[PDB]
Amino acid sequence: PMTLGYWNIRGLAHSIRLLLEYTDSSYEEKKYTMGDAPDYDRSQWLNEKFKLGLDFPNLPYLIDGTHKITQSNAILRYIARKHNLCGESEKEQIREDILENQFMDSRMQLAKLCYDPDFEKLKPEYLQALPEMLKLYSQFLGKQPWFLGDKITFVDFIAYDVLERNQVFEPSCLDAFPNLKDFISRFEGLEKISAYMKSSRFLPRPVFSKMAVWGNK
């Protein structure tokens, strides 16, 4: 089978779910539910973490036949290669590698904030820096429909998740960046993406786990 294992939240699995849907993959999900405060029990996961044959047990994981893959970027690249959704030219591969890692840094900046006990005090600093962050992505995208040019590739699924999560956080944040606004709309307008988003499989919320200060519900 093809099985995606992750917590029952958006988190690091959003881009993977969207890519599985876009590629018309035949997959099922193993959803782990963290317990409520105060214990935030992880037993649903911990009771099988070491029983799945994973080399480096973690969430998310993808099982595809005999392939057992962890690390969200490795999972995305695996699916992308399977469906010819990677950068082709050297210049495209450079952009792909820069963006995969840059978007991960941006993702981690937001996650660090949203789990920080000092969230309320720290949020203004994040918001002050947000337009500059977005400006750099806007400049890089330029006039192209997708981040690697005319063809959609896996890094667009990363880009969508990170950019759209920032819109959930600060609704107006993309408004100053026409190309980013149009990118979100173009992605959500893709046939398989809009089909997914009208279905009960779509899991836009909670953004983060039960322990988060923001995005826990």
Ligand X SMILES: N[C@@H](CCC(=O)N[C@@H](CSC[C@@H](O)c1ccccc1)C(=O)NCC(=O)O)C(=O)O
3-state SS assignment for residue 29: strand
- Residue span binding its own copies (CB under 8 A) among the ranges 38-46, 133-141, 175-183, 184-192: 133-141
Is residue 41 close enough to count as binding ligand X by CB under 6 A?
no
Question: In the block, which residue shows the tokens 């699924």?
Answer: 157
Which among ligand X, its own copies, none contacts residue 90 (Cβ within 5 to 8 A by kind)? its own copies
Residue 115 is assigned to a ligand binding site: yes
State the binding string over 73-102 for ligand X (x if CB under 6 A, else -). Answer: x---------------------------x-
Closest to ligand X by CB, 76 or 86:
76
Sheet holding 67-70, edge to edge: 28-32, 2-7, 61-64, 67-70
Q: Give the E-state strand segments of the chain in sequence order.
A: 2-7, 28-32, 61-64, 67-70
Q: How many residues does the chain have?
A: 217
The residue type at 200: S
- Residue span binding ligand X (CB under 6 A) among the ranges 23-31, 71-79, 155-163, 168-176: 71-79
Give the residues across from 4 on adjacent strands.
29, 62
Q: Are 165 and 110 in contact (CB under 8 A)?
A: yes
Q: Are 2 and 25 in contact (CB under 8 A)?
A: yes
For binding to its own copies (CB under 8 A), which residues are involved? 55-56, 67, 69-74, 77-78, 81, 90, 93-94, 97-98, 100-102, 136, 139-140
For binding to ligand X (CB under 6 A), which residues are involved? 7, 11-12, 49, 58-60, 71-73, 101, 105, 209, 211
